[PDB]
């Protein structure tokens, strides 16, 4: 009866997939790939933010730091669009409390 609990990002990837291509499915291996990919990007960004924080003797990670790290790690137009989405997200979240 003993049973563990392993979390993932699967269900959310499935949601996004159904949003962009309703008549399409995805296999377990690829979902695992996407899971590992998400984990990798998460680790890179958080580590980079940490390094920026530590270099400026600031003890708080904010949206600003994330934005900076994004501009550092990713190239060009991808950065700009993603940054747009992030800013839009913050503007929506901060208003409709």
């Amino acid at each position: 009866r003993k049973r563990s609990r392993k979390e993932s990002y699967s269900i959310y990837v499935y949601k996004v997939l159904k949003q962009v291509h309703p008549d399409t499915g995805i296999s377990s291996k690829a979902m695992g790939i996407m899971n590992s990919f998400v984990n990798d990007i998460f680790e890179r960004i958080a580590g980079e933010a940490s390094r920026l924080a530590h270099y400026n003797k600031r003890s708080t990670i904010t949206s600003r730091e994330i934005q900076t790290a994004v501009r550092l790690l990713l190239p060009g137009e991808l950065a700009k669009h993603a940054v747009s989405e992030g800013t839009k997200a913050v503007t929506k979240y901060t208003s409709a409390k």
Binding site: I33, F37, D40
Partner: protein, 86 residues
């Protein structure tokens, strides 16, 4: 009798398999001396990675090498691997 299959070692990584691998890279024509050198190269790569993996294994007081150890050992060499967790 002397088989020890061809060396009981890397030489089981047979020639036509290396040929197929070179075919994946778009290559058309291969020299006869390539094979052995490639094998040596392969060994070195494996050696380094396996060493690191075994080291991770040694830290947890296990006798079973898990996939995670291979992933991390590959990540430190700048050859991160996706699709096996992490």
């Amino acid at each position: 009798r002397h088989r020890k299959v061809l060396r009981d070692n890397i030489q089981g990584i047979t020639k036509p398999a290396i040929r197929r691998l070179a075919r994946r890279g778009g290559v058309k024509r291969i020299s006869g001396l390539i094979y052995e050198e490639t094998r040596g190269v392969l060994k070195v790569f494996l050696e380094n990675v396996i060493r690191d993996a075994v080291t991770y294994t040694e830290h947890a007081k296990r006798k079973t090498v898990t996939a995670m150890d291979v992933v991390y050992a590959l990540k430190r060499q700048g050859r991160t691997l996706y699709g096996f967790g992490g």
